[PDB]
Amino acid sequence: TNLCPFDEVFNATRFASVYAWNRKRISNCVADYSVLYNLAPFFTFKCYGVSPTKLNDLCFTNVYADSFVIRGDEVRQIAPGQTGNIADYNYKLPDDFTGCVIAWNSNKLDSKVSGNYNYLYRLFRKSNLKPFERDISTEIYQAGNKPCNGVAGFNCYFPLRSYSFRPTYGVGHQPYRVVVLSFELLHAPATVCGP
Amino acid sequence: STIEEQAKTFLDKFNHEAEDLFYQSSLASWNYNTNITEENVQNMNNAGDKWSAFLKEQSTLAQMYPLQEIQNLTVKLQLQALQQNGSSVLSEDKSKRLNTILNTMSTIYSTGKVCNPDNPQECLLLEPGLNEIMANSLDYNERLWAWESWRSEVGKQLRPLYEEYVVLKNEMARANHYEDYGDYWRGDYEVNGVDGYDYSRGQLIEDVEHTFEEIKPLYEHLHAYVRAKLMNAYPSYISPIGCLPAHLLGDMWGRFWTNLYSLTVPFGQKPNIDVTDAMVDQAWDAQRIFKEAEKFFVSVGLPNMTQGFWENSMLTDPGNVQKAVCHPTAWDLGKGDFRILMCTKVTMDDFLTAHHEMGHIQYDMAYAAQPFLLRNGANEGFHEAVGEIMSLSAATPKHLKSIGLLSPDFQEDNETEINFLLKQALTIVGTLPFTYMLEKWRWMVFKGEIPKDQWMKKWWEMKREIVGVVEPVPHDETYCDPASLFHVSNDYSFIRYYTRTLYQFQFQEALCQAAKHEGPLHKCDISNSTEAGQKLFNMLRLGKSEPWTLALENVVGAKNMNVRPLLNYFEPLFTWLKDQNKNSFVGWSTDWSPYA
Ligand SMILES: *[C@@H]1O[C@H](CO)[C@@H](O[C@@H]2O[C@H](CO)[C@@H](O)[C@H](O)[C@H]2NC(C)=O)[C@H](O)[C@H]1NC(C)=O
Ligand SMILES: *[C@@H]1O[C@H](CO)[C@@H](O)[C@H](O)[C@H]1NC(C)=O
Ligand SMILES: *[C@@H]1O[C@H](CO)[C@@H](O)[C@H](O)[C@H]1NC(C)=O
Ligand SMILES: *[C@@H]1O[C@H](CO)[C@@H](O)[C@H](O)[C@H]1NC(C)=O
Ligand SMILES: *[C@@H]1O[C@H](CO)[C@@H](O)[C@H](O)[C@H]1NC(C)=O
Ligand SMILES: *[C@@H]1O[C@H](CO)[C@@H](O)[C@H](O)[C@H]1NC(C)=O
Ligand SMILES: [Zn+2]
């Protein structure tokens, strides 16, 4: 009776910036999915490929937990076949995605009166991200045709920008914590079954 | 990568940095306006300075993208607005001179005081001191003293400044490729590159003068009826054929004739509709008022107020210790944060104001999804027009009876109908010749058509001829009477109040037709009409993204300002005035003056 480390992922003190989203590989444990409803009416729980409706009678090879913080408006981009700064430049789900997206408002933790600049996101990139790719590069984005020489200036922008979370923002601009459960099925013995 | 793609990327970075920095300044400004301390002043100025300095840096950076090489109009609008923001067209010395002048004129206006003859220690400011006299006093001499003292001791101070103010404002505007500073102001209505919706700056003058001609008959009979009623109250002071003395018009300038209602009321035995007693009877508070105003907008299909609105707004006076700036204002700080600052009392007037200010909030929320630089009314007259039409419906007996504030046993008759329209006309119609004639004078001064030695000469020739108002004391060129009004000495354009007035009745006529309103336009209530709300919303969500001519067409079906709905709204009064003036002289002689 080995219990899967979900309290590690969900109840973490500080989530990762979405550009540097955090992945926790899960294996060799009993996954108690049916007990995840312990948040402030967690505003989202939508699954793709599998059913959340008590379909934890199923076994998977490995389960990957991906966690990050975005604003309420951007949660619609954590889904297959979406576009936007997040889905194009920070965290991209594939068209054939099989898993679940969990999100809840974390204004009480991730907002601050002076503005919480801890959480960043990527604003510029030469191209979109492949599914489940991660880019943490801090190289100056060359928007013009002159080289940038590694410093910010005209047509040369630092590719990352900050969310500046304040508690008085509207709901669309408030911080939301997201956990993306990616279910894997390889030609190998299932190590993760959850009764 | 093209220059248009470089501009799109630049605007992307600007939109993020500006949204955060603007929020810091708005919040810091809010914390002062609701809790007046010395530290909150410093935080407001520090946050304001950072925002101003960010706007100056980004204005310069935006100009390094030349507009002629962008095709996307939505991008060019944003680029142009940021470029047209910087004043880095005048040398640092002339920029510095001009800001000092602006500060000195603003300081003179706000701290200008007048001390009663015979005591140097009894001294009054304009607000509330002189404003109280001009709005309540019936004594001819007291009003003449306040009127003249304000212009001769504060106005004369502003004359040498305004002269230098015109020169520098023209230099700045000419170097931005405008004919003059008046042409610069008319730039707010310009539209280019959209076939069928373009509008030139000089077209505004023609449309204002064309629409004003159709207003003259209504204004002449309003002016004729007012002069007759005042002549009864001041038989030795007013000529039956002359202009109205400037100090007997209800405020310091005669901008609004609202306070003449007591002396001009058509039927003084029928009481006005005042629901203040019924609000207190039902133990209404401020939250009930705004809750009702929210219900109004929900009834037409618009969204309810955000949760952040109710938590963060200040709807009641803070208290004795905590001091506030109680001027009612709607705040769009960005990032979903919308608030109203308002020291609400349980009165009918504040009840209507709540609908007016929440009308602004609805506009702000509707275009919040537009780019930062396009989050505004379609032009300078749109935003205020939206606010006004909400208080038109909210105040009708139909709307008041449906919310339980007016008794069902109260029925309208054409006498209270006429009393209402006259009171409305005193405010709405009376300000139109005042507003047109003030801006025309400034347009001509900036154009160079009025020499310095004939400033006050032409000012009173235009007051007499256009407004039918005559100065009670001769004024030479040591005076600067136009500058004795806030907007003139505080560098604000003024024609917006004229265009807004015309827009607001075009809006209301259109929305009431969508509401299938039967009867005179002034009795209409758009409540419960989702088709009306949809028509309005299709313009609100546009912001500045579309030409103001197109945005207007979305609501009213016409591409241009029109004065027929305004005349439609006042038609019952117009016919009643003409029948009242059947044995009166209509029009005025400009040669008569009270100083003989
Ligand atoms: C440049 O843009 C700023 C944006 O805020 C303008 O500043 C505002 O101007 C209006 C009207 O003049 C005032 O009511 C606001 O209070 C101003 N805000 C600030 C910064 O205090 C500014 O007017 C623009 N400059 C021009 C005319 O190009
Ligand atoms: C997080 O903590 C709460 C309360 O301690 C608990 O109910 C919840 O199950 C925890 N989350 C997970 C994923 O275990
Ligand atoms: C008003 O501002 C002061 C700082 O100057 C602050 O200490 C105080 O708590 C504020 N009061 C309220 C009610 O916000
Ligand atoms: C202009 O740019 C915006 C944003 O990139 C785009 O959505 C719009 O379609 C463009 N319009 C034209 C005419 O290219
Ligand atoms: C606004 O209306 C929506 C439903 O239309 C509702 O879910 C929401 O709770 C309402 N908000 C408030 C503050 O009542
Ligand atoms: C009100 O309307 C009736 C219509 O027959 C008219 O006779 C009456 O004179 C009007 N009263 C006033 C005060 O206008
Ligand atoms: Zn307003």
Side-chain angles (χ1 to χ4, degrees):
Chain A
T1 68
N2 215 22
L3 299 93
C4 289
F6 281 156
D7 189 82
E8 273 196 37
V9 167
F10 285 78
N11 283 331
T13 303
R14 181 188 312 263
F15 272 48
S17 297
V18 62
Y19 87 98
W21 52 276
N22 216 291
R23 164 161 280 176
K24 215 262 176 291
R25 174 172 179 169
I26 287 157
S27 37
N28 296 121
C29 57
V30 156
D32 201 4
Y33 302 122
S34 296
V35 183
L36 260 53
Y37 306 67
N38 288 250
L39 305 155
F42 63 112
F43 296 55
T44 308
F45 192 108
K46 311 179 190 212
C47 296
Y48 307 83
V50 82
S51 302
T53 62
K54 302 192 181 71
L55 202 43
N56 59 295
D57 60 48
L58 205 183
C59 295
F60 295 100
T61 312
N62 307 120
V63 176
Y64 298 116
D66 301 340
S67 49
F68 45 85
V69 157
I70 58 184
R71 24 174 289 201
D73 280 359
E74 280 160 349
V75 179
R76 69 132 192 118
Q77 303 179 30
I78 310 303
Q82 299 284 356
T83 82
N85 280 338
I86 302 301
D88 301 333
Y89 300 150
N90 299 265
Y91 186 80
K92 174 63 175 177
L93 287 182
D95 286 315
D96 58 1
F97 173 63
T98 281
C100 303
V101 173
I102 314 170
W104 64 96
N105 187 291
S106 62
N107 206 31
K108 297 182 177 181
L109 307 177
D110 292 325
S111 284
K112 173 166 66 112
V113 170
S114 49
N116 181 30
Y117 290 83
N118 164 81
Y119 290 108
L120 312 186
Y121 69 95
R122 185 173 303 276
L123 185 56
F124 308 112
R125 201 171 196 268
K126 290 199 218 301
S127 60
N128 289 7
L129 288 181
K130 294 165 56 188
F132 295 118
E133 191 179 335
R134 186 197 297 104
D135 185 11
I136 69 172
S137 171
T138 86
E139 187 197 20
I140 301 292
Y141 179 85
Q142 186 194 357
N145 299 321
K146 297 179 180 178
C148 290
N149 296 343
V151 82
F154 178 76
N155 276 335
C156 285
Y157 314 121
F158 188 69
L160 305 179
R161 281 314 193 278
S162 174
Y163 276 123
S164 65
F165 282 136
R166 299 187 172 84
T168 49
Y169 286 5
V171 164
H173 299 256
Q174 275 169 32
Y176 279 69
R177 293 189 173 192
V178 184
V179 179
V180 181
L181 300 178
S182 315
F183 299 114
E184 210 175 35
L185 209 64
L186 302 172
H187 274 158
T191 71
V192 181
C193 303
Chain B
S1 65
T2 66
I3 188 74
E4 167 168 315
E5 295 167 336
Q6 271 156 77
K8 287 183 178 178
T9 303
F10 164 78
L11 290 174
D12 272 331
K13 174 222 81 173
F14 170 85
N15 291 325
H16 179 100
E17 302 209 20
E19 190 141 1
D20 174 46
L21 268 167
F22 176 81
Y23 188 96
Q24 303 195 236
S25 176
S26 309
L27 182 54
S29 183
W30 167 272
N31 291 321
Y32 160 68
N33 281 278
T34 61
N35 175 18
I36 299 181
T37 64
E38 226 300 316
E39 187 184 7
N40 288 135
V41 177
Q42 291 283 74
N43 289 115
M44 179 188 178
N45 294 130
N46 296 332
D49 291 342
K50 293 185 176 182
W51 170 238
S52 299
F54 170 84
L55 266 178
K56 188 189 169 191
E57 275 175 351
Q58 300 290 299
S59 184
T60 303
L61 289 165
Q63 295 170 349
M64 302 176 181
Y65 307 86
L67 286 195
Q68 53 164 280
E69 321 196 50
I70 312 79
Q71 333 304 339
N72 192 322
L73 295 170
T74 278
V75 171
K76 201 190 294 203
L77 288 180
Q78 310 175 51
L79 248 187
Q80 191 175 3
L82 197 53
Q83 290 176 14
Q84 279 282 2
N85 193 229
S87 295
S88 190
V89 65
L90 268 196
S91 57
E92 281 141 307
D93 179 71
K94 288 189 158 148
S95 166
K96 262 149 54 186
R97 286 184 202 236
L98 180 56
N99 292 319
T100 293
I101 294 172
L102 294 170
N103 282 262
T104 302
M105 295 195 306
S106 172
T107 293
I108 290 180
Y109 187 89
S110 55
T111 73
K113 71 168 76 74
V114 156
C115 303
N116 90 289
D118 297 329
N119 189 12
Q121 283 290 309
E122 176 188 350
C123 299
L124 301 169
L125 293 162
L126 175 64
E127 173 68 24
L130 296 179
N131 280 341
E132 195 278 325
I133 296 177
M134 306 303 290
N136 299 113
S137 176
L138 302 184
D139 178 55
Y140 182 95
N141 287 330
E142 184 188 11
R143 302 177 59 88
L144 173 56
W145 166 78
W147 190 94
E148 171 62 23
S149 307
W150 179 247
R151 285 160 184 78
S152 90
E153 282 148 53
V154 180
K156 292 195 180 186
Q157 288 193 50
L158 298 162
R159 178 59 188 261
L161 294 159
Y162 206 78
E163 291 185 349
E164 197 179 0
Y165 156 89
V166 169
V167 173
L168 289 170
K169 281 294 190 177
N170 276 336
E171 288 190 16
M172 165 265 165
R174 266 138 205 178
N176 284 104
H177 312 124
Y178 292 89
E179 310 172 10
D180 46 82
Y181 192 52
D183 189 53
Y184 180 88
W185 274 348
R186 296 189 292 273
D188 187 76
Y189 300 85
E190 185 172 24
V191 169
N192 286 307
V194 186
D195 282 72
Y197 296 90
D198 286 356
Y199 197 88
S200 70
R201 300 190 296 268
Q203 186 71 14
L204 178 73
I205 303 177
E206 323 199 321
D207 292 14
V208 165
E209 294 179 342
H210 192 282
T211 54
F212 183 72
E213 287 288 326
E214 326 188 47
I215 278 170
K216 286 187 177 182
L218 175 55
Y219 183 67
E220 273 178 29
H221 289 273
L222 182 63
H223 179 280
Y225 172 73
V226 167
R227 177 175 57 191
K229 302 289 286 184
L230 289 190
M231 187 176 62
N232 293 2
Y234 303 88
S236 63
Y237 292 117
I238 290 166
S239 160
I241 69 165
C243 295
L244 296 168
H247 66 286
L248 305 175
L249 293 175
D251 60 28
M252 179 59 69
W253 317 267
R255 182 188 179 199
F256 305 107
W257 294 4
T258 304
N259 298 316
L260 305 186
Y261 181 71
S262 71
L263 292 176
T264 62
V265 55
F267 311 99
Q269 308 244 52
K270 287 233 169 63
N272 301 326
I273 292 187
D274 192 15
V275 301
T276 302
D277 278 355
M279 300 172 73
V280 185
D281 287 350
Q282 302 176 14
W284 284 29
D285 50 356
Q287 203 194 140
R288 175 67 181 274
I289 294 176
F290 286 84
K291 225 75 183 180
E292 290 288 341
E294 185 189 42
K295 184 201 270 196
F296 166 80
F297 292 110
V298 169
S299 69
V300 304
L302 293 178
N304 46 8
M305 294 290 99
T306 67
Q307 184 182 343
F309 173 88
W310 298 108
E311 293 168 6
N312 298 312
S313 306
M314 195 190 67
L315 308 179
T316 67
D317 203 303
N320 44 287
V321 197
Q322 192 178 342
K323 312 239 67 175
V325 176
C326 279
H327 189 64
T329 47
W331 292 69
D332 186 1
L333 309 83
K335 296 171 145 302
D337 186 8
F338 307 97
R339 308 179 190 187
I340 284 184
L341 198 169
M342 185 173 170
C343 305
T344 302
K345 311 294 151 53
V346 189
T347 71
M348 181 179 181
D349 289 330
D350 281 348
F351 167 83
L352 298 180
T353 302
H355 291 73
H356 174 106
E357 295 300 331
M358 189 168 291
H360 290 291
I361 295 295
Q362 287 289 350
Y363 207 165
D364 298 338
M365 299 184 301
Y367 59 55
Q370 294 280 355
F372 177 86
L373 291 168
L374 303 182
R375 298 173 188 165
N376 228 308
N379 61 29
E380 58 186 22
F382 261 68
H383 227 298
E384 217 54 48
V386 177
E388 285 291 344
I389 68 182
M390 309 311 166
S391 52
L392 281 176
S393 299
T396 60
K398 185 166 128 137
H399 185 90
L400 292 175
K401 280 160 68 216
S402 75
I403 66 176
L405 285 181
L406 198 60
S407 46
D409 296 359
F410 184 101
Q411 199 68 253
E412 309 95 50
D413 52 69
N414 46 345
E415 312 204 337
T416 55
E417 181 191 56
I418 287 299
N419 280 342
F420 175 81
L421 291 192
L422 188 272
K423 166 87 126 174
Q424 291 285 89
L426 291 178
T427 304
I428 301 174
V429 179
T431 197
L432 295 177
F434 176 93
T435 297
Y436 162 59
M437 174 263 151
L438 186 144
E439 202 79 312
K440 214 207 185 315
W441 181 89
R442 290 206 294 192
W443 287 346
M444 297 172 72
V445 160
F446 296 137
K447 239 148 184 169
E449 303 174 347
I450 304 181
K452 272 166 52 172
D453 68 335
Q454 293 169 12
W455 271 11
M456 302 310 307
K457 190 195 182 193
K458 249 289 184 176
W459 172 262
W460 285 112
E461 287 186 5
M462 296 168 65
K463 279 279 193 177
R464 294 159 181 252
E465 180 192 324
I466 300 175
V467 198
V469 173
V470 55
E471 71 279 24
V473 169
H475 282 184
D476 54 12
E477 304 310 319
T478 65
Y479 289 85
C480 197
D481 297 342
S484 71
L485 178 63
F486 167 82
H487 302 66
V488 176
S489 57
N490 285 260
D491 191 45
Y492 289 109
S493 79
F494 208 71
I495 204 66
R496 79 228 295 171
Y497 304 102
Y498 181 88
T499 62
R500 168 220 89 187
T501 294
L502 273 65
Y503 294 155
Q504 85 185 37
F505 292 110
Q506 297 181 247
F507 288 171
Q508 182 75 344
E509 194 196 61
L511 299 189
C512 296
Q513 180 207 102
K516 306 169 184 296
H517 170 72
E518 297 276 11
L521 180 56
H522 77 267
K523 312 179 68 182
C524 156
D525 180 12
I526 67 171
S527 299
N528 288 328
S529 178
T530 55
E531 311 94 62
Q534 189 68 68
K535 214 159 221 302
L536 173 67
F537 183 86
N538 294 334
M539 178 267 303
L540 298 183
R541 63 155 293 271
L542 293 180
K544 261 188 60 174
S545 69
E546 297 287 353
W548 73 265
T549 54
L550 172 58
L552 181 61
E553 187 196 64
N554 281 22
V555 199
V556 313
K559 301 180 182 181
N560 199 352
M561 183 177 52
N562 196 5
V563 79
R564 189 195 47 77
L566 166 70
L567 303 179
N568 182 24
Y569 183 91
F570 287 102
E571 177 148 353
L573 178 75
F574 187 34
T575 45
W576 181 89
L577 285 177
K578 285 189 291 182
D579 188 71
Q580 275 290 320
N581 305 338
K582 62 185 175 298
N583 50 27
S584 286
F585 190 78
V586 181
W588 50 82
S589 153
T590 65
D591 74 308
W592 177 91
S593 73
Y595 57 89

